[PDB]
Write an enzyme that holds these catalytic residues in place. Structure first.
Site, mmCIF file in Angstrom:
data_model
loop_
_atom_site.group_PDB
_atom_site.id
_atom_site.type_symbol
_atom_site.label_atom_id
_atom_site.label_comp_id
_atom_site.label_asym_id
_atom_site.label_seq_id
_atom_site.Cartn_x
_atom_site.Cartn_y
_atom_site.Cartn_z
ATOM 1 N N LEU A 34 0.835 -1.158 0.120
ATOM 2 C CA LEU A 34 0.092 0.089 -0.086
ATOM 3 C C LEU A 34 0.724 0.852 0.118
ATOM 4 O O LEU A 34 1.862 1.551 0.970
ATOM 5 C CB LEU A 34 -0.952 0.114 1.277
ATOM 6 N N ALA A 36 0.290 4.073 0.787
ATOM 7 C CA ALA A 36 -0.371 5.092 1.873
ATOM 8 C C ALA A 36 -0.382 4.187 3.302
ATOM 9 O O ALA A 36 -0.646 4.729 4.124
ATOM 10 C CB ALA A 36 -1.865 5.305 1.401
ATOM 11 N N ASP A 37 0.096 2.936 3.131
ATOM 12 C CA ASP A 37 0.173 2.200 4.290
ATOM 13 C C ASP A 37 -1.084 2.144 4.851
ATOM 14 O O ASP A 37 -0.910 2.163 6.392
ATOM 15 C CB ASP A 37 1.428 2.477 5.103
ATOM 16 N N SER A 38 -2.227 1.989 4.204
ATOM 17 C CA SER A 38 -3.484 1.899 4.963
ATOM 18 C C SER A 38 -3.724 0.598 5.469
ATOM 19 O O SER A 38 -4.799 0.417 6.196
ATOM 20 C CB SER A 38 -4.638 2.389 4.164
#
Length: 82
Positions: A34, A36-38
């Site tokens: 990810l 956005a590292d969500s």
């Protein structure tokens, strides 16, 4: 990592969105991807640590590679599980 562990871990990920029916499972299938590292890792580390019944730390479950490396990690934690 033993195939038994590789299949287990890969399952925990599928359960996240109810998978494993008409989808192909792979040990190289990077679970973490990810921009956005969500993605929620806490939920993943908990599942594995729970099912396998081991004692892993966030620091040990934050930079884990694909299922390949993941399974290998849990393996060592299953040796003494302490």
């Amino acid at each position: 990592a033993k195939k038994e562990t590789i299949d287990k871990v890969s399952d925990i990920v599928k359960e996240k969105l109810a998978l494993g029916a008409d989808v192909v499972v792979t040990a190289d299938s990077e679970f973490s991807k990810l921009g956005a590292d969500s993605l929620d890792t806490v939920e993943i580390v908990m599942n594995l640590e729970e099912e396998f019944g081991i004692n892993v730390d966030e620091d040990k479950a934050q930079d884990i590679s694909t299922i390949q490396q993941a399974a290998d990690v849990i393996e060592g934690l299953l040796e003494k599980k302490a």
